[PDB]
Structures are given as C-alpha cells and as structure tokens.
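Hi,

I'm pasting everything inline rather than attaching a file, because the server keeps stripping attachments. The sequence lines come first, and each chain or strand is labelled.
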Amino acid sequence: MTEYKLVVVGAGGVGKSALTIQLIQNHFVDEYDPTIEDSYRKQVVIDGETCLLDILDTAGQEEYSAMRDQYMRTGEGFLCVFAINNTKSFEDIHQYREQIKRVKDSDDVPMVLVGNKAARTVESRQAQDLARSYGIPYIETSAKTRQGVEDAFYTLVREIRQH
Amino acid sequence: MRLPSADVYRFAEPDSEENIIFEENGIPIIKAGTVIKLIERLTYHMYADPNFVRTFLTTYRSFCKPQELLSLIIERFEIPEPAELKRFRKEYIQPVQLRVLNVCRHWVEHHFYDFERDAYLLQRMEEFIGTVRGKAMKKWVESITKIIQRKKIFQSSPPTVEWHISRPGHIETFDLLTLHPIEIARQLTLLESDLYRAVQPSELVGSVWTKEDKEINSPNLLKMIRHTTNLTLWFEKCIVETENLEERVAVVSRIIEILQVFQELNNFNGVLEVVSAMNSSPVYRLDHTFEQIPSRQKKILEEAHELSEDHYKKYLAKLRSINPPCVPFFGIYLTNILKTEEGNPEVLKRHGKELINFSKRRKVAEITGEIQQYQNQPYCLRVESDIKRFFENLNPMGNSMEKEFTDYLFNKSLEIEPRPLPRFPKKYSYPLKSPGVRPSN
Amino acid sequence: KXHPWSVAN
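And the predicted assembly:
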C-alpha cells in the first residue's frame, strides 16, 4: 500500500507536540507511550484511499538546530506549526519554510500551515493571508477538543496527492 | 488494627476508589492517588519502599511544591493517639516515623538542590529534625544532620596520545587536518562524555529545558547541545570553506575517519555530529566532493547515517547491544520526556475527585534513570589539555546570527560547486594524507 | 539516486 512520511516543524515551548499526539491518541484514550511504533504511525482512510501516516515530531530538540536539515530531509510533506496565542512562533514560520524549501530543493514542497490553540494574539485573517502568499492551505486546530486535527493532517496528505 | 479519627489526622482516612489506584501483576504499584494518599504509601507502616521513594522524590514538583512536601510529611509524622496501645506505637507510630525520617534522608542526600534554592526550606527541615525525640530517635537522626552539614559546603594504561603534522605544544598550528584524526575523535569524546555526565535530572524533569527559564534550570543540558551544534557547524564550515576540490575531498575524508573512531569509542553524540553535518544543505549537494570519496568510507558513512533512519530504530538497537562507556545522543531522551509529560494527563478523575497521575511521573523517572546509567562508566583515555582547549574555544559562527551564517554556508556551497565547475587554488601548504585510524602500536 | 554516500547505484 501507500505510506506518507510527514514532518512537523515549529517553534518549541508552545506545545506543538499536542498536534501529532492528538491525531494518534485513539480518542477517549490517553495512555500515550512515545517509545513504541503505534505512537507515531497511524493508518487512515482519506478520500476513499487507504494509507499509513508516518509522522516525525522532534519536539524537545529545538536547540539541536544544526540537526534541522537532516530531520527535514526525511519528509515528503510538512506541517508548519505555530501557536495562535504566541506571535513569535508565527514569525518563525517564514524562515522555517525557507529551510524546508532549501533542503528539499523545490519551490513548492507539499506543506500546510497549522495554527494551534490562553488569549489569542494571531488573528485568523493574518495567518490566512500568510498562507495565501505561499500557495499552501491553512488549518486551525484545537489543542483541547481535537477540532481541526484530522482536517490538518488529511489536508497535507491531499497536498501530496495533487502534486 | 485501629487508627485515629481522620479529624486530627488526615492520613488516617482509609483507601478507597476516590483515593488510590494500582496496576496489575510483590509490592503493589500506584497508578494514581490524592497527594495525602501518596505521602501515605510513601511512609507506609506495613512496608518500606525505597524505589517508590527515589521515584517520588525525582518527579514531585510537577504536583507538589517542596514547601508543601515538608508540611505534608511533618503532618504525617505528628500522630495523635486513639493500656493496649502497645500495638499502635509498635506497628504504626514507630515504622511510620522511621519512613518519614528516612524520606528526609533521601531528600537531603540526593536532592539537596531544593534546599540551596530555598533557604527557609532548609531552615524548616533543620527545625523539624531538631524536634525529634526519643533517645533512639536522636541517635538515628544524628546522621541525617551529618548529611546536611556535609552538603552545605583501570586495567591497562590508556593508549598513547596520537600526533600528526602539528607537534605537541604548537597550538597555533592546530586544525582539522594537522591534528591526528584518532586523537581528534578521542578528545572530542572526552569533552562530550563529560558534557553528557554533567546533565542532572533536575534539568530534564518537567520538560523544564523547553520553557522560558530554560537558561536558568537546564544550563548543563544546553551547554552540551551547544557543543554538539557547534561541532556540526565547524565540520560544515571546514568543508564548504575549502574551495579546492582536492583539499575538500581530503577534508570530507578525514571527517569520515573521525566518524569511524567515534563509532569505535561508541560516542553516538559524536557520530550524529558528523551525520548531521553530512546531511546539511551546504554539504549534501557537493556531488563533486562525494564523487572522489572511496567506497570503503562511503560505506562507513552510510552505515552511520543508517542509524538515524526509521526514528533511530538502529541507534536504539546498537545502544542496547553495546557495553559502556558511551555517549548517547540526548535528543531522543528529550523528546520522550517531553511527549510523556505533555501527552498524558496531569490528573485522573474518579467519582468526581481529582487524583495525581503518578505512573506518568514514573515513566519520566525511568528515562532519567536510563540516562544516569550511561553516566557511570568513564573513558580509558588520556586527556590532552591543548587539543581539548582548542575544541572548547571553537566558534565557527563568529559574531554572526544563525541565519546570516547558514546562508553564508549555503552561498559558499554554491560558490564552490555551482548548479561549469570552476577551479579554486590550494589553501593548505602541509600535505593532505591521513595517517589513518589504525593506531600506532 | 539514494544519498551522495549510498551503495554505487
């Protein structure tokens, strides 16, 4: 079958780990053990077609900056994550995308912009505009109700599939 | 037996579903429970529990402040009574007080940093110690006080240091090609093993190195990661700043040799320094450089890079399979700690009551412990103070910011191997032949 | 093809 190698890129210290965890936390369950395989390789149905998601989230290794290239090199699709109540995590996005493009040696890599939801400081129209400038989609996700999580990941899969 | 009324003694209140939950399978393992009921089983009268004590003390400030901890264990110590009370002072009052004192033992012994930060915390501790009574109690607690006054202040000879073009003493000549590759990997392994050993669990527990006060709480960890980052950057900078293709193939080759010696010394942080350098955007694309690289060393570097793939499945396998001393790569530990904390609830709700989730804290403690096991054994290797100070004072970034510098690197990669290939003049006057990674005698 | 250091082709 088909398996997609996705990578999560975003500033640390605003809980970007909540994105992948929530996707895989098989809902109503919490006993998350990050060490095993099921913790980062779900399998899903997406527009009728079945595939397996392989999600790389190096949350906690931000200070290993000269390791970003290596990490990014391993992916065919990227979620660029910022926190909608932390503005700096949003201004980090442009350089992150510059790094992804340089690594994969293309000017349009499949990628989606995800803002994760304390009091909001990044209005939706801002990040809407920022996504449009790149030709990539935008998805808001809730870090506490799972809203938008599935939506974000499936959207990135569809971006790879229409490439 | 029979206990006080739960109105002059909170711990007297008995276990229930709204109180404590356990696991499966000896001494029973706490899944979760109110803080009252955790101090209880931490100083239980029916059995001592040195393991649960170490774990609790390592991981508690994410649900109990140290001051609250002292207050709780003191409230546990001062027990009311309910002449057939001999059973009580014999099967309760006395072992419970044993465990309370013996928890202060551990807290003061292994975790003294709580008292260096809060001086009045130590003052409360010393008061509580100095109000213990019973002629046996005094003689037991005397040693606990010794500890406080304390804290308030090979097989064969290691192999010969190896030298190349640069002679001992000539620090001016030190550089990636003039030092001996073996000694380079040796001395970097010494720096990196020390940097590693020095990481204390107080910096890893609580995901505390990812938060706004990371510079305050995790200085050892950050100093180590900045070493590793610095070394990867210095490697890249050596490669792309060597504009001659002949000299640059020499450079990439010597660096793969250093990688081999890292592999031998089981210095996995060292292995990943070089692996990440090879994966960087400025270096990855130099097809003309990797062309002239012999296949022996290409399989070396391939095998090394293999380890990172599939979420490090192979590095984890090899780190298991080998025998200390070693330098593990720390980032996997960091990610597992962070995801365990942020990915499991702080609390479990049963019957509309809130119960501290403790097995999450135990899962953290296991990872910190696996870290500290690899911190025990050290390396049979002579320190070379000058090579060491050379690598300490490396600063490949100069005064430049991160992006300014990574850009400079990439732009040098395009200068030296464009998307015809130009020709650049030689920069090293000394020869370019590696003496190799097989030692001397 | 693979990496600049992968097995020949």
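Chains C and A do not touch (no CB pair under 8 Å).

If the labels don't parse on your end, tell me and I'll reformat.
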